[PDB]
Scaffold this motif. Structure first.
Motif, PDB file in Angstrom:
ATOM      1  N   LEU A 131       2.153 -15.884  32.599  1.00  0.00           N
ATOM      2  CA  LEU A 131       3.368 -15.047  32.771  1.00  0.00           C
ATOM      3  C   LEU A 131       3.688 -14.218  31.526  1.00  0.00           C
ATOM      4  O   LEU A 131       4.272 -13.188  31.680  1.00  0.00           O
ATOM      5  CB  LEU A 131       4.543 -15.938  33.142  1.00  0.00           C
ATOM      6  CG  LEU A 131       5.809 -15.226  33.590  1.00  0.00           C
ATOM      7  CD1 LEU A 131       5.550 -14.322  34.807  1.00  0.00           C
ATOM      8  CD2 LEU A 131       6.851 -16.276  33.885  1.00  0.00           C
ATOM      9  N   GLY A 132       3.335 -14.689  30.355  1.00  0.00           N
ATOM     10  CA  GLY A 132       3.640 -13.993  29.095  1.00  0.00           C
ATOM     11  C   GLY A 132       2.660 -12.905  28.694  1.00  0.00           C
ATOM     12  O   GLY A 132       2.865 -12.278  27.619  1.00  0.00           O
ATOM     13  N   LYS A 133       1.631 -12.625  29.505  1.00  0.00           N
ATOM     14  CA  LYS A 133       0.549 -11.799  29.037  1.00  0.00           C
ATOM     15  C   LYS A 133       1.064 -10.400  28.642  1.00  0.00           C
ATOM     16  O   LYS A 133       0.577  -9.850  27.637  1.00  0.00           O
ATOM     17  CB  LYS A 133      -0.584 -11.649  30.041  1.00  0.00           C
ATOM     18  CG  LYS A 133      -1.735 -10.844  29.442  1.00  0.00           C
ATOM     19  CD  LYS A 133      -2.992 -10.812  30.228  1.00  0.00           C
ATOM     20  CE  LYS A 133      -3.956  -9.811  29.632  1.00  0.00           C
ATOM     21  NZ  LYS A 133      -5.193  -9.781  30.444  1.00  0.00           N
ATOM     22  N   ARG A 134       2.039  -9.862  29.370  1.00  0.00           N
ATOM     23  CA  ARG A 134       2.508  -8.491  29.100  1.00  0.00           C
ATOM     24  C   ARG A 134       3.849  -8.440  28.333  1.00  0.00           C
ATOM     25  O   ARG A 134       4.547  -7.412  28.355  1.00  0.00           O
ATOM     26  CB  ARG A 134       2.581  -7.666  30.378  1.00  0.00           C
ATOM     27  CG  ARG A 134       1.254  -7.650  31.129  1.00  0.00           C
ATOM     28  CD  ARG A 134       1.250  -6.800  32.386  1.00  0.00           C
ATOM     29  NE  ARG A 134      -0.003  -6.954  33.106  1.00  0.00           N
ATOM     30  CZ  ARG A 134      -0.507  -6.100  33.990  1.00  0.00           C
ATOM     31  NH1 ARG A 134       0.012  -4.892  34.135  1.00  0.00           N
ATOM     32  NH2 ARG A 134      -1.572  -6.457  34.699  1.00  0.00           N
TER      33      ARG A 134
ATOM     34  N   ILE B 231      -2.752 -11.367  40.485  1.00  0.00           N
ATOM     35  CA  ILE B 231      -2.443 -11.800  39.137  1.00  0.00           C
ATOM     36  C   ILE B 231      -1.602 -10.708  38.429  1.00  0.00           C
ATOM     37  O   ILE B 231      -0.656 -11.032  37.729  1.00  0.00           O
ATOM     38  CB  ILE B 231      -3.689 -12.235  38.323  1.00  0.00           C
ATOM     39  CG1 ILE B 231      -3.263 -12.810  36.971  1.00  0.00           C
ATOM     40  CG2 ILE B 231      -4.739 -11.116  38.186  1.00  0.00           C
ATOM     41  CD1 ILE B 231      -4.386 -13.494  36.224  1.00  0.00           C
ATOM     42  N   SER B 232      -1.921  -9.431  38.656  1.00  0.00           N
ATOM     43  CA  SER B 232      -1.146  -8.393  38.003  1.00  0.00           C
ATOM     44  C   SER B 232       0.320  -8.426  38.436  1.00  0.00           C
ATOM     45  O   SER B 232       1.228  -8.210  37.602  1.00  0.00           O
ATOM     46  CB  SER B 232      -1.720  -7.041  38.168  1.00  0.00           C
ATOM     47  OG  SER B 232      -1.835  -6.678  39.530  1.00  0.00           O
ATOM     48  N   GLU B 233       0.597  -8.688  39.724  1.00  0.00           N
ATOM     49  CA  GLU B 233       1.998  -8.743  40.156  1.00  0.00           C
ATOM     50  C   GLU B 233       2.735  -9.870  39.463  1.00  0.00           C
ATOM     51  O   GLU B 233       3.898  -9.699  39.085  1.00  0.00           O
ATOM     52  CB  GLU B 233       2.071  -9.094  41.645  1.00  0.00           C
ATOM     53  CG  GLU B 233       1.815  -7.934  42.493  1.00  0.00           C
ATOM     54  CD  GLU B 233       1.704  -8.531  43.901  1.00  0.00           C
ATOM     55  OE1 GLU B 233       0.588  -8.572  44.292  1.00  0.00           O
ATOM     56  OE2 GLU B 233       2.776  -8.878  44.608  1.00  0.00           O
TER      57      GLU B 233
ATOM     58  N   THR C  39       6.135  -9.505  36.767  1.00  0.00           N
ATOM     59  CA  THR C  39       7.374 -10.031  37.291  1.00  0.00           C
ATOM     60  C   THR C  39       8.420 -10.075  36.183  1.00  0.00           C
ATOM     61  O   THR C  39       9.569  -9.794  36.477  1.00  0.00           O
ATOM     62  CB  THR C  39       7.157 -11.383  37.962  1.00  0.00           C
ATOM     63  OG1 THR C  39       6.321 -11.105  39.085  1.00  0.00           O
ATOM     64  CG2 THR C  39       8.446 -12.000  38.428  1.00  0.00           C
ATOM     65  N   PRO C  40       8.108 -10.371  34.893  1.00  0.00           N
ATOM     66  CA  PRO C  40       9.151 -10.382  33.886  1.00  0.00           C
ATOM     67  C   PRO C  40       9.826  -9.019  33.672  1.00  0.00           C
ATOM     68  O   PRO C  40      10.815  -8.982  32.942  1.00  0.00           O
ATOM     69  CB  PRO C  40       8.434 -10.791  32.599  1.00  0.00           C
ATOM     70  CG  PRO C  40       7.334 -11.674  33.106  1.00  0.00           C
ATOM     71  CD  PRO C  40       6.838 -10.885  34.321  1.00  0.00           C
TER      72      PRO C  40
ATOM     73  N   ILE D 221      10.207 -21.811  37.784  1.00  0.00           N
ATOM     74  CA  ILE D 221       9.843 -20.616  37.080  1.00  0.00           C
ATOM     75  C   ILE D 221      11.012 -19.609  37.130  1.00  0.00           C
ATOM     76  O   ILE D 221      11.128 -18.810  36.210  1.00  0.00           O
ATOM     77  CB  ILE D 221       8.528 -20.004  37.626  1.00  0.00           C
ATOM     78  CG1 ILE D 221       7.922 -19.052  36.598  1.00  0.00           C
ATOM     79  CG2 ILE D 221       8.737 -19.347  38.989  1.00  0.00           C
ATOM     80  CD1 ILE D 221       7.289 -19.726  35.437  1.00  0.00           C
ATOM     81  N   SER D 222      11.862 -19.670  38.152  1.00  0.00           N
ATOM     82  CA  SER D 222      13.017 -18.817  38.261  1.00  0.00           C
ATOM     83  C   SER D 222      13.978 -19.109  37.097  1.00  0.00           C
ATOM     84  O   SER D 222      14.472 -18.189  36.435  1.00  0.00           O
ATOM     85  CB  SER D 222      13.669 -19.034  39.601  1.00  0.00           C
ATOM     86  OG  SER D 222      12.792 -18.597  40.604  1.00  0.00           O
ATOM     87  N   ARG D 223      14.200 -20.381  36.836  1.00  0.00           N
ATOM     88  CA  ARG D 223      15.032 -20.787  35.691  1.00  0.00           C
ATOM     89  C   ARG D 223      14.403 -20.322  34.388  1.00  0.00           C
ATOM     90  O   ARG D 223      15.119 -19.876  33.468  1.00  0.00           O
ATOM     91  CB  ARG D 223      15.203 -22.303  35.724  1.00  0.00           C
ATOM     92  CG  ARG D 223      16.092 -22.778  36.858  1.00  0.00           C
ATOM     93  CD  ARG D 223      16.049 -24.283  37.028  1.00  0.00           C
ATOM     94  NE  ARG D 223      16.437 -24.774  38.351  1.00  0.00           N
ATOM     95  CZ  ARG D 223      17.687 -24.838  38.769  1.00  0.00           C
ATOM     96  NH1 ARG D 223      18.653 -24.440  37.952  1.00  0.00           N
ATOM     97  NH2 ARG D 223      17.981 -25.287  39.987  1.00  0.00           N
ATOM     98  N   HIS D 224      13.083 -20.510  34.241  1.00  0.00           N
ATOM     99  CA  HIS D 224      12.383 -20.088  33.055  1.00  0.00           C
ATOM    100  C   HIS D 224      12.592 -18.591  32.819  1.00  0.00           C
ATOM    101  O   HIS D 224      12.860 -18.156  31.706  1.00  0.00           O
ATOM    102  CB  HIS D 224      10.893 -20.408  33.124  1.00  0.00           C
ATOM    103  CG  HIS D 224      10.096 -19.644  32.128  1.00  0.00           C
ATOM    104  ND1 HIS D 224      10.091 -19.963  30.775  1.00  0.00           N
ATOM    105  CD2 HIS D 224       9.316 -18.561  32.257  1.00  0.00           C
ATOM    106  CE1 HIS D 224       9.303 -19.098  30.155  1.00  0.00           C
ATOM    107  NE2 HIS D 224       8.789 -18.245  31.039  1.00  0.00           N
ATOM    108  N   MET D 225      12.515 -17.796  33.878  1.00  0.00           N
ATOM    109  CA  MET D 225      12.590 -16.335  33.726  1.00  0.00           C
ATOM    110  C   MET D 225      14.008 -15.909  33.338  1.00  0.00           C
ATOM    111  O   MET D 225      14.165 -14.888  32.612  1.00  0.00           O
ATOM    112  CB  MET D 225      12.041 -15.595  34.955  1.00  0.00           C
ATOM    113  CG  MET D 225      10.549 -15.613  34.992  1.00  0.00           C
ATOM    114  SD  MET D 225       9.835 -14.505  36.224  1.00  0.00           S
ATOM    115  CE  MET D 225       9.766 -15.593  37.645  1.00  0.00           C
ATOM    116  N   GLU D 226      15.013 -16.634  33.813  1.00  0.00           N
ATOM    117  CA  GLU D 226      16.381 -16.339  33.404  1.00  0.00           C
ATOM    118  C   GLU D 226      16.569 -16.700  31.930  1.00  0.00           C
ATOM    119  O   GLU D 226      17.177 -15.907  31.174  1.00  0.00           O
ATOM    120  CB  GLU D 226      17.405 -17.068  34.266  1.00  0.00           C
ATOM    121  CG  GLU D 226      18.809 -16.702  33.827  1.00  0.00           C
ATOM    122  CD  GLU D 226      19.900 -17.054  34.812  1.00  0.00           C
ATOM    123  OE1 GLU D 226      19.756 -18.092  35.525  1.00  0.00           O
ATOM    124  OE2 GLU D 226      20.913 -16.313  34.816  1.00  0.00           O
ATOM    125  N   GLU D 227      15.979 -17.823  31.510  1.00  0.00           N
ATOM    126  CA  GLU D 227      16.120 -18.333  30.112  1.00  0.00           C
ATOM    127  C   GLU D 227      15.439 -17.333  29.173  1.00  0.00           C
ATOM    128  O   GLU D 227      16.049 -16.832  28.191  1.00  0.00           O
ATOM    129  CB  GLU D 227      15.506 -19.738  29.986  1.00  0.00           C
ATOM    130  CG  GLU D 227      16.293 -20.894  30.633  1.00  0.00           C
ATOM    131  CD  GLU D 227      15.571 -22.186  31.069  1.00  0.00           C
ATOM    132  OE1 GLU D 227      14.431 -22.402  30.587  1.00  0.00           O
ATOM    133  OE2 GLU D 227      16.108 -22.931  32.002  1.00  0.00           O
TER     134      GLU D 227
END
Ligand code: ICS
Ligand code: ICS
Ligand SMILES: [Ca+2]
Ligand SMILES: [Ca+2]
Ligand SMILES: [Ca+2]
Ligand SMILES: [Ca+2]
Ligand SMILES: [Mg+2]
Ligand SMILES: [Mg+2]
Ligand SMILES: [Se]
Ligand SMILES: [Se]
Lengths: 477, 522, 522, 477
Positions: free
Chosen positions: D204-207, D256-258, D262-263, D279-285
């Motif tokens: 998830l952090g790649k970009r 994988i690109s989508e 997502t972030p 992962i929803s919580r992670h993305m908000e954090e």
């Protein structure tokens, strides 16, 4: 088997019959003598079948509708009478064509007047006129109609010639009345004759006063090839590679226009003598067109035929002839090299209609096989004259063989392969004798020409040598 | 040309360029063919509602019928009797056709003789043909019975079979007590199934009419079963199997299953199995007689009720769940034998299959044709499966039958979009499947040409054929199948659902286009 | 959008323009997809001989296997015993998958329990899981026997099933006399068939090892039959039917045909039928023991030979003509029963079918896969039909087996172009059917993806799948079929020939193009 | 059935069990009280299954490989360990996608390391490294690899994270180690959590440092729709008709690109709470992206969801929202008019995984049907909190139901329809109870959105009202 042994076999088999049948059948069974040139000294043919004996023959309707007329692809052929005849004969014969079925071509369809009681009692001529109008409405691209009479039509006194003339004039359409009722003649044979006379009387002269077709010195027609599995196409290709122009095919993949153009050709090439000698003679009488018999079964006969045909033309066609023969030499030699060692010495018995029982013998011989018995459903003595020199000394010949006779001959002779029809096929398989259909080609073919010989050889080998035949005896018996 | 290690038959040989070029030259030079654009225009027109309206106005022309002639059915009936030779008085060309037709469907020998009447018989009739024909047949083929029917020539010239057979016996051509039952089978009345009824009633009369004064209904504790015109070996077999499982004494009257399925063991057997003369003579002593295909056994029914005094039950063909249940319950009532555990279980296995397959069958639309009883049973079972028979065609059907089928359609919501057609042929059916396209056709091999036609319009218009009926000539060994009973219903269900799933797989096989729905599990 | 009177499911809903446009936008916006030309390039490359050589160099990667794991086989074996609950010691995820896999193939309930070992059991092992599991299973589901196998967790941590079961009985969790046969079934050894052998040998040992002193070979006058891993109901049925017709006393050891075919009559039956405990106890008293699938019954064979002292005959699977003949002749020898007229006739009907269909079968080329015994039997019968089995794949086959099949190929000219592959998967097979294209594949439902792939290259390269094997998940009720004996051979022949003729009809259906060869009669 | 009756049904059913199982199972069965907001007062969940009782649950590998990772279409997912797990799970779940399978997309393929004895004894990390090289050779268009651990991997001490790092670095490739061995957790549930953490840690952090994506104010992601039968596509269409841009679908038809984009979105729309709340919580954090639960089952829920989503944006989206609702109004009203009279009053029992047992209740109610019992295989109490308000008073709730319990409950309650999975389907059909698969949609669907409701309604009707159900009793019993 010796001559004496075969004669003994004939007498033993005839023992089962009542006296009248025994005396008749004796005249239709012979031991070949290739010295004899007048077959009327050794066999009778083209007589009525004996009642109750399970002849394999059909009727004049089969010979006209099923054989001669039915293949003509851009006409609609009406099976006129009750529903049975047209249904049983619908797409049973593999007379191949190119067309759009139901639209411009109609060969595998069954058109019928489906006679009911009221039509028997009061006649079917009004029904036929109304039927013709319905055909014209629903099949507008038909190029002509034939009316194939079934048994009741002549028996009840209908006048299909009047209907054909009146309707034909009203619609400016060729409508051909064919009096091929099954009560006529004794077999398919008279249907051929009837059908040929109907072509003569109603179709062939249409363009007699037309000078528009551009003829060439190399124009021929293929007469008496019904394109079973594409046989006429695999013949035509060779004629055209030899530099001829095939104006017409009678009647496999045939069109009404090709028939009408046939009086413009230089030479009629007759494959099936029995079915089309009639119209071939007519065309020589009326138009001065010569005809000749040929044979495209197997390389030896095909080469002999190409050379004999080319000899009717000039040096340019004789040169192309040799080119064709050289082209295909390696192809048929490869077929022989592969399959002859698998078939050499195997013995075959045939029983077919009016041409193939003699015509295919060369192709068998090209694979080293021996035809030890042969016979015809409906041949005449001129066919037997042509047979006796093609068959070996002391082989068995049978005319209008009964079911009983054929089974008993096979039991004695024990051929390696039998080539006959659908009514025979399943009998002989149960006896453990490899069987090939020699009408339908067992849904294979073509068998004519060089390309056909490859398929013929493949087919005889796949059946004669099949692993199934070693398995009929249970290992506990 | 050929390559010796990969020999081409007609397909695909004639697609080689040299053959293609040759066929184009033939066409252009000599065939005076209608232009392709005109062919296309006419084809399209034959797919229209306008064309369908003209088509359905036909009165005189029949195109691609879905029936045959009476004597075919007489021959099949006769084959079901022990050591019996079918014999058709009349023209031999008929017999060549009857044998070949059955040969192609069963892939088996079919023995039948003619007495080879020719044009000469129109003067003074076929009496001499009958005398010599009977003598010759008996000597040569050694039948124990000869069952005589007629071709249309013999009917039109008016030959009196009874008198002719009697005179054959009087003059010593065939023994006085040798059985020669007969029936008149005019091809211009009804159809092949009518010929079966005629023949059967003739055979029943021959063995029973004059001997009725010693018969007592129920004295032999059996039920007679009359199958009618039947071309699936599994149908004779399943009826015999179910009755045997129930412990019901029975006599199957006309039973060709052995003679249509002899082993390939080195000998040809002209005759095998079949109903015995003893069974036919004793038949009036049964408890009752059940007709499996009542809509073509009306003459037989009149004889059995009027002469044998059997109270023939009002039973539909035993096809599908409800009608197989009704048959077994009636047999139980007559025989006093309970329905056994084995058949109860078989029934529940069919119901299980129905529950398993219902989602794919639901709402599927069918065109179908055949003989009346087969067609009604197929319609009934399709309604039981939640399918919609929409085009129901029975060329040889009648008004009374059509009313019966219209009643069956009314008892089900799945009948709401269905129409029954009688007297119409496969060229009529062709229009219906273009104008009111179903999902599938259920029919015999003549259906393949309709499928071909529909595909020509376009892949989205193609109506695949499912082969159930008679004749089937372009597949092998389907004549071994079953359509009756729970076993037949299981076979029909399996064929239908897998036909649906096969088509779905075809439609979803396109990579990155429709294969999102190419599921492993269905 | 939907139209309420013609609702579209996924196919063809997502072909509507609005969905197509949406899907194109998703791709172009967010998927960073390889260009179509590159997808096409790579696809083409995957059809090549160069790619095939790389594919066949794989040592570590398996793609699209044609086998499953041991406990699946143990479960099927166990289901074949009367009132028996399959019990897999280890992880519950396994049992969800085993049940679902069989549920999809049989369209039936599949009862199996786990004792739900978790990570905590790595410290201490799964003894407490076994104690409570056995108690709970016996109480809740009331089996008369629990047959225990293992998942790979239980094997890796080293749980001693024997000790655990013994301790369960010692401490009163289950009665001492309650039967709990067991087998170790590691997923990382062999395949599902191995698990069947292990389970069966475990059950045989349980009921016989300690009670051999009173046994006498031949004293019960029966033959034991061990079917192995078998997923066609018709196979259990045909063996029983043939032995009953012959009047041979027999015991079929593992017989799930009833529990995999219960009726839908308003009750669920967790158990039905099956081999009785009495049959297993009495099995050493048989004349002999016949193994239907010997190439996965090697451990069973050693036990039966070594402990029961049966002289197990060297018989191939009874598939096709010659091997069915050999099976019947051996059974006749052991039992003293003659082969009855009914079976002789059936054999001759099969031979008849062979003679009838040989022209269409001759020379046809097949790729096929499956388990070892099934595959060798299919190869043998294909040779008997004059077909060429050119690509023979058995993922779970071994060297000895491959030598045996290579010998079978050598005894026939129809074997000359054939290769046997062991340890190769369906991604290997995919290459073979591109590089050395056969006419058809005979295989399970996973072959549909190979057919899809072949069609993508072009219609002329498409290799149609004929579904025979396990699992079959995309057709309904094929598990009712038969592949053994003469009946199975008749079924296989019919399926093959009709698959050939269906394809030929497809290829000849093109109006004015290829329909010159669209014959009514074949 | 009254509360007292249901309570007495529970006690009666639990009588069969040994005491330890009885005491455990009592805690997992409840009679609903929609007044209760804290489900930890009335039911226990997300505990171990009792040994021997025929749970319907799966394992953590099913939750990771089968559920979260396997749908991602342009990655190759390795089932790492012995052959079974990958084979049973191959194409069992209808997570639909668009791609060229075997070339750029791999979802229905089974890639496995097929562990043998030598791999258990000596470890599989050298095999995994070799396997990765073989994947790269034979599947060059793959866009990443995941390694889905089966039971043996952790048990034998393999180090798949080291292999993933080393090989990923060597090949410049995303290679994701997932420790989803089936021995972990108690059900599918922990596999979700493991899988979410693996996306977090390796993808998830790649970009994070990349600013090139052209974001808009209307960018959303669909989180927790696995596109069963196309469900995510029938959801997506509505969101985009409302003027939103769906940057990603997790994970049905997902790339994988989508995932990596997502972030960059403005709002995460969570359908399946249970599987993707992590992962929803992670993305908000980490990224400040808000998330919200929604429900696209049936028109009532779909309309409520569209309005609540649109409320997070501006007036232009709120306006488009009402346009969408107006467009589809006649379509779903026509569905209701046709099917609700056919289903009104019919009673339903459900048993499914982690979301659908509550999420579909509105759709049933839109057809006049009543859900009289529901339960989950692997839900937590936060799921039950959300359920008790959606279910009627005195209905039956069951957590990790045993096969015995489910049968006995059905026998007493006699629902008109059951909605559950493949291991339940054939049981209930034999009992004469109409059954719909509510995982696979019985090979039908989609069920999400307006277009999905039409198919749902058709399906429930075709099964509940099918003529087969009247046929189970033989008329002689
Ligand atoms: Fe009869 S005289 Fe009859 S070469 Fe043609 S139908 Fe020959 S397709 Mo069938 S095969 Fe000359 C015939 Fe065919 S030996 Fe046969 S009976 S017309
Ligand atoms: Fe599990 S928590 Fe499990 S909405 Fe999805 S596989 Fe829900 S395709 Mo199968 S149907 Fe949320 C699941 Fe599917 S109720 Fe089911 S068990 S991820
Ligand atoms: Ca035969
Ligand atoms: Ca046969
Ligand atoms: Ca079932
Ligand atoms: Ca509204
Ligand atoms: Mg469909
Ligand atoms: Mg559409
Ligand atoms: Se002929
Ligand atoms: Se899940």
């Amino acid at each position: 088997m010796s001559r004496e042994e075969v004669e003994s076999l004939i007498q033993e088999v005839l023992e089962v019959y009542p006296e009248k049948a025994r005396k008749d059948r004796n005249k239709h069974l012979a031991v070949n003598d290739p010295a004899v040139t007048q077959s009327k000294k050794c066999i009778i043919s083209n007589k009525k079948s004996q009642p109750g004996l399970m002849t394999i023959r059909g009727c004049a309707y089969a010979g006209s509708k099923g054989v001669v007329w039915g293949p003509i692809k851009d006409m609609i052929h009406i099976s006129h009478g009750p529903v049975g005849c047209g249904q049983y004969s619908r797409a049973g014969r593999r007379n191949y064509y190119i067309g759009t079925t139901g639209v411009n071509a109609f060969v595998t369809m069954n058109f019928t007047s489906d006679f009911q009681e009221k039509d028997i009692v009061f006649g079917g001529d009004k029904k036929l006129a109304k039927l013709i109008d319905e055909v014209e409405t629903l099949f507008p691209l038909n190029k002509g109609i034939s009316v194939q009479s079934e048994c009741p039509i002549g028996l009840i006194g209908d006048d299909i010639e009047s209907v054909s003339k009146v309707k034909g004039a009203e619609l400016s359409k060729t409508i051909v009345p064919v009096r091929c009722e099954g009560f006529r003649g004794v077999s398919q044979s008279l249907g051929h004759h009837i059908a040929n006379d109907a072509v003569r009387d109603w179709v062939l002269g249409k363009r007699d006063e037309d000078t528009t077709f551009a003829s060439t010195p190399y124009d021929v027609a293929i007469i008496g090839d019904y394109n079973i599995g594409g046989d006429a196409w695999s013949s035509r290709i060779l004629l055209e590679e030899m530099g001829l122009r095939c104006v017409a095919q009678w009647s496999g993949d045939g069109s009404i226009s090709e028939i009408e153009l046939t009086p413009k050709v230089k030479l009629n090439l007759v494959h099936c003598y029995r079915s089309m000698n009639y119209i071939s003679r007519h065309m020589e009488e009326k138009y001065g067109i010569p005809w000749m018999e040929y044979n495209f079964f197997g390389p030896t006969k095909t080469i002999e035929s190409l050379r004999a045909i080319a000899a009717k033309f000039d040096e340019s066609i004789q040169k192309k002839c040799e080119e064709v023969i050289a082209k295909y030499k390696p192809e048929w030699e490869a077929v022989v090299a592969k399959y002859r060692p698998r078939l050499e010495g195997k013995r075959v018995m045939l029983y077919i209609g009016g041409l193939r029982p003699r015509h295919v013998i060369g192709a068998y011989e090209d694979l080293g096989m021996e035809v030890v018995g042969t016979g015809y459903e409906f041949a005449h003595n001129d066919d037997y004259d042509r047979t006796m020199k093609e068959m070996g000394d002391s082989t068995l010949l049978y005319d209008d063989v009964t079911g009983y006779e054929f089974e008993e001959f096979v039991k004695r002779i024990k051929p390696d392969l039998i080539g006959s029809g659908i009514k025979e096929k399943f009998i002989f398989q149960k006896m453990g004798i490899p069987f090939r259909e020699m009408h339908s080609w067992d849904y294979s073919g073509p068998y004519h020409g060089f390309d056909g010989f490859a398929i013929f050889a493949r087919d005889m080998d796949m059946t004669l040598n099949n692993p199934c035949w070693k398995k009929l005896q249970a290992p506990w018996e | 040309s050929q390559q010796v290690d990969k020999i081409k038959a007609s397909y695909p040989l004639f697609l080689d360029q040299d053959y293609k070029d040759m066929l184009a030259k033939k066409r252009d030079g000599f065939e005076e063919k209608y232009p392709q654009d005109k062919i296309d225009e006419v084809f399209q027109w034959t797919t229209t509602k306008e064309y369908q309206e003209l088509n359905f106005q036909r009165e005189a022309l029949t195109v691609n019928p879905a029936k045959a002639c009476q004597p075919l059915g007489a021959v099949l009936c006769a084959l079901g009797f022990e050591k019996t030779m079918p014999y058709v008085h009349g023209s031999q060309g008929c017999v060549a056709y009857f044998r070949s037709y059955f040969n192609r469907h069963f892939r088996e020998p079919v023995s039948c003789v003619s007495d080879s009447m020719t044009e000469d018989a129109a003067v003074f009739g076929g009496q001499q043909n009958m005398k010599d024909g009977l003598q010759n047949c008996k000597a040569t083929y050694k039948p124990d019975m000869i069952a005589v029917s007629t071709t249309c020539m013999a009917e039109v010239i008016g030959d009196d079979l009874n008198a002719f057979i009697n005179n054959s016996k009087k003059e010593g051509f065939i023994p006085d007590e040798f059985p020669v039952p007969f029936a008149h089978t005019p091809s211009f009345v009804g159809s092949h199934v009518t010929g079966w009824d005629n023949m059967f009633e003739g055979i029943a009369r021959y063995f029973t009419l004059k001997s009725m004064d010693d018969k007592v209904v129920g004295s032999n504790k059996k039920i007679n079963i009359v199958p009618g015109f039947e071309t699936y070996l599994g149908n004779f077999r399943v009826i015999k199997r179910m009755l045997s499982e129930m412990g019901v004494g029975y006599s199957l009257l006309s039973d060709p299953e052995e003679v249509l399925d002899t082993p390939a063991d080195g000998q040809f057997r002209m005759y095998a199995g079949g109903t015995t003369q003893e069974e036919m003579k004793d038949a009036p002593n049964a408890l009752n007689t059940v007709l499996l295909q009542p809509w073509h056994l009306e003459k037989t029914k009149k004889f059995v009720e009027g002469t044998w005094k059997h109270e023939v039950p009002k039973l539909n063909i035993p096809m599908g769940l409800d009608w197989t249940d009704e048959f077994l319950m009636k047999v139980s009532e007559i025989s006093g034998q309970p329905i056994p555990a084995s058949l109860t279980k078989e029934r529940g296995r069919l119901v299980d299959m129905m529950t398993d397959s219902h989602t794919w069958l639901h709402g599927k639309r069918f065109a179908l044709w055949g003989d009346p009883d087969f067609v009604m049973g197929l319609v009934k079972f399709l309604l039981e499966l939640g399918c919609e028979p929409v085009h129901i065609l029975c060329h040889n059907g009648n008004k009374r039958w059509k009313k019966a089928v219209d009643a069956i359609l009314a008892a089900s919501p799945y009948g709401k979009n269905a129409t029954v057609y009688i007297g119409k042929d496969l060229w009529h059916l062709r229009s219906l499947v273009f104008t009111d396209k179903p999902d599938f056709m259920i029919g015999n091999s003549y259906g393949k040409f309709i499928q071909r036609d529909t595909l020509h319009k376009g892949k989205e218009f193609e109506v695949p054929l499912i082969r159930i009926g008679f004749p089937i000539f372009d597949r092998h060994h389907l004549h071994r199948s079953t359509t009756l009973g729970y076993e037949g219903a299981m076979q029909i269900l399996t064929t239908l659902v897998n036909s649906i799933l096969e088509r779905l797989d075809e439609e979803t096989r396109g990579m990155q286009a429709t294969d999102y729905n190419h599921d492993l599990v269905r």
